[PDB]
Amino acid sequence: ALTQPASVSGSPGQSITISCTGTSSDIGGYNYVSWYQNHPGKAPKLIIYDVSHRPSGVSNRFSGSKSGNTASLSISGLQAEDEADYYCCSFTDNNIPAFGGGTKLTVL
Amino acid sequence: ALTQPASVSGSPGQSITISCTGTSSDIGGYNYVSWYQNHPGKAPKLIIYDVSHRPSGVSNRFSGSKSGNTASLSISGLQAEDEADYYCCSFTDNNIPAFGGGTKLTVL
Amino acid sequence: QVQLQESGPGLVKTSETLSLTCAVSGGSISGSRYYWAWIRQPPGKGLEWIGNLYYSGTNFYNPSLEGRVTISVDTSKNQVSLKLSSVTAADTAVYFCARHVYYSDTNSYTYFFDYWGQGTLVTVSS
Amino acid sequence: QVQLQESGPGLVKTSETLSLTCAVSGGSISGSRYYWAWIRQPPGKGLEWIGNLYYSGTNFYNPSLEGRVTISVDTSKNQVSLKLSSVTAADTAVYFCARHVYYSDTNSYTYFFDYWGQGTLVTVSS
Amino acid sequence: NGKLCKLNGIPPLELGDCSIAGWLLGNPECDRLLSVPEWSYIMEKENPRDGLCYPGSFNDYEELKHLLSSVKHFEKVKILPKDRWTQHTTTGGSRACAVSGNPSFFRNMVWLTKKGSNYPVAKGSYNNTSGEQMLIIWGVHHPNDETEQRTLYQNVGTYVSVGTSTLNKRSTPDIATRPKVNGQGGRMEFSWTLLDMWDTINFESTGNLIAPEYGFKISKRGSSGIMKTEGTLENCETKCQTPLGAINTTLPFHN
Amino acid sequence: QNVGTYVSVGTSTLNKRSTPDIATRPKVNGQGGRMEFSWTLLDMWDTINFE
Ligand SMILES: *[C@@H]1O[C@H](CO[C@@H]2O[C@@H](C)[C@@H](O)[C@@H](O)[C@@H]2O)[C@@H](O[C@@H]2O[C@H](CO)[C@@H](O)[C@H](O)[C@H]2NC(C)=O)[C@H](O)[C@H]1NC(C)=O
Ligand SMILES: *[C@@H]1O[C@H](CO[C@@H]2O[C@@H](C)[C@@H](O)[C@@H](O)[C@@H]2O)[C@@H](O[C@@H]2O[C@H](CO)[C@@H](O)[C@H](O)[C@H]2NC(C)=O)[C@H](O)[C@H]1NC(C)=O
Ligand SMILES: *[C@@H]1O[C@H](CO)[C@@H](O)[C@H](O)[C@H]1NC(C)=O
């Protein structure tokens, strides 16, 4: 599994970053990191794929990158509507998906 | 489903006709009307197929025809042994069989 | 000259699955001119088609009684079989298997139930 | 624009087999760029992958939850399904089906869960 | 003389922009060739347009073109009338072969598809009692994907089986994504045989069968050939014809 | 991992689908297996797909 901060927080209008750390086997090896937004009561929404790309319909306030074995989800212009759990997922040497623990994002 | 008289009757020795009415979709469209004779306690016997043809072993007192959306079973020389339920079946635009309600034939 | 014979429980309880099997003898179940049909006759009612086994294609069923019916085959036994899920009182009937001929031996299409088994009576109750 | 919808018992008893089915509509289940995935989220926990349906290959599963899981398909219904044997309290979760894309439409490999159903909550108890 | 002439008093078959395959299958743009009089030679344009409107291939095509050399007239005979195919849909087609916008198909062929939700085994046969050896063409549809296969035919693991006293062929469709040709990612494969006099050809299919409606009875079998030319018939006569014009001479050599 | 496999290759003119033949064979160069090669010419501006 991948390691994520249990919880992050910030004020509306601020940029906040959610990290995801893995090994060379998942994150470092491949550029297949994706992120999901999950509001309570709903299925997860794909927000980012292939490290930095967005699906059509996803807000441009979402972006991402990676360095070494660490992936990063960046949310600019934080809104009240962004309170959600966020998850990282990546590919790995063992050809199965890997998910992170999940980060709860609290907007103040 | 196809519409049949609930019941018909006649005296021994008379010719009796059992009709079956459908739409252009089943009867009118195709020349695939078949009839069955069903005595209580036994499985249905095929008596007529392809509107007017008989299987080998079927009495020549049985015949049939169609006009428009109406099919007809004709039993000449009515015998006591002919008391049975009779059923019509035809093909249809929706490629599944269609059966009629069934007619009870009473011999007096 | 093929003989068809139905066999199965004469009693199934409400909401259980009814499973009937037809043995075919004196002929094959495989062929390109036939479908194997299941037909039932509730007491006091006419003949209701349930569905067909299309050995070399896909099976098809009566659209009302569609979501509850499965028809299959066992080629080592030369048997065909019917399963009706969630059975209710309305499913009490004499169940029959039949050889449904759609292609004739005279190079044309036809449409009739040629051979019938004698049927098995199944009661559905609580 | 494919819709995915999970359905099944919201309660299974301890040591029984849980069986959930996902209907796929607005798209096929067959394709060479996708796997069908089952994912679950126990209350208070993150997302755990259960396993994938590889329509044209072999199925593969989470190595922990491997000996207890079967994933299969019904092509007449355009449904995929999950079975978990010997269920225990730890198996209470919201179960989801998803379209897992491994090959892109730009001539390269990718890796993401594109479509998700809304999920079905299953309780396991004694 | 610079002209394309009648050879031995008989006009050539001028295909215009049609290929041999387009002609025999019934490409909708080759309607002028549906009824053909006896010809002395065939005038085929090099790189013709009106060929297989539905993208595909034709097996043993060069052998067929060779066969048609020593033929001259042939009669088109209905073998498997379109309306015999009850319990099937005989009205399928494609925008690729469209006529006046409306989707259409090769005119001498029947594209059998599902009726209602079913595709019964498609069967039929023909006994060659026509008086002479007959040319029969049939084909197999190869879908771009499984969805197309299920949409046109309910059955997926399908086959097409054709045979005679000498022919024994069983094909299955190849479902695959392909580059589009004439707008379609699908392909249609055609093949042919000659049905010997008094023999019988049987067809059987669970899907993907493009059935012939007609066969072609060979009528004359004289000596001829296929010429490649962009010209037309000029209302003149010869004994020797080159692609550049007719030759009228008694000399032993020409250049 | 997969056993009932296929190899599919095509262009605007090529349409080929092969399956492997698993069989015991006499060894050649130490192997009882065989590898079959084929080729095409891809016309200019066309596309070849493999699956
Ligand atoms: C295919 O047809 C031939 C010819 O049948 C005859 O000619 C037809 C035009 C028509 O008038 C038919 O009713 C005729 O029977 C069949 O060959 C004949 O078979 C009979 C019986 O064995 C024999 O007496 C004749 O001499 C045969 N004639 C010839 C020219 O061979 C042939 O059997 C049919 N094929 C099949 C599979 O049925
Ligand atoms: C395969 O590629 C050709 C060529 O594409 C162009 O040349 C390349 C070298 C590159 O610079 C591309 O970005 C160019 O677009 C495609 O054919 C072209 O298609 C466009 C759009 O329909 C048309 O305007 C051009 O005239 C075409 N050029 C030629 C030489 O035919 C072709 O469509 C591609 N095939 C597939 C399946 O995508
Ligand atoms: C060839 O020329 C002669 C005159 O020299 C003419 O009579 C004859 O009709 C011409 N040819 C042919 C092939 O018809």
Numbering used by the authors:
A (entry chain G), B (entry chain F): 3 to 9, 11 to 30, 30A, 30B, 30C, 31 to 95, 95A, 96 to 107
C (entry chain D), D (entry chain E): 1 to 35, 35A, 35B, 36 to 82, 82A, 82B, 82C, 83 to 100, ...
E (entry chain A): 48 to 54, 54A, 55 to 82, 82A, 83 to 92, 92A, 93 to 125, 125A, ...
F (entry chain B): 196 to 246
Sentences from the paper on this structure:
Influenza A viruses are categorized by their surface glycoproteins including hemagglutinin (HA), which binds sialic acid receptors on the surface of a host cell and mediates fusion of the virus with the host endosomal membrane. While only the H1N1 and H3N2 influenza A subtypes currently circulate in humans, the H2N2 influenza virus poses a distinct risk. A recent phase 1 clinical trial investigating a ferritin nanoparticle vaccine displaying H2 hemagglutinin (HA) in H2-naive and H2-exposed adults enabled us to perform comprehensive structural and biochemical characterization of immune memory on the breadth and diversity of the polyclonal serum antibody response elicited. The molecular details of cross-reactive and strain-specific monoclonal antibodies (mAbs) isolated from H2-F-vaccinated individuals were revealed by high-resolution cryoelectron microscopy (cryo-EM).
To assess epitopes targeted by cross-reactive and H2-specific head-binding antibodies, mAbs from B cells collected post-vaccination were isolated and characterized from six participants from blood collected 1 and 2 weeks after H2-F boost. nsEM epitope mapping revealed distinct patterns for each mAb group: H2-specific mAbs targeted a variety of epitopes on the HA head including RBS, vestigial esterase, and antigenic sites Sa and Cb, while the majority of cross-reactive mAbs targeted the RBS. The non-RBS binding mAb 4-1-1G03 targets antigenic site Sa interacting across two protomers with contributions from its light and heavy chains. In contrast, the majority of pre-exposed participants had baseline pAbs targeting head and stem epitopes, which expanded after the H2-F first and/or second vaccine dose to target variable head epitopes. Moreover, secondary exposure through H2 vaccination in pre-exposed individuals or H2-F boost in naive individuals expanded the diversity of pAb responses to target variable head epitopes, shifting the dominance of pAb landscapes to the head domain. However, it is important to note that H2 vaccination can also induce responses to variable epitopes that overlap with conserved ones, leading to competition for the same antigenic site. All maps were of sufficient quality to build atomic models of HA bound to Fab except in the case of H2’s cleavage site, which had heterogeneous density and was omitted from H2 models.
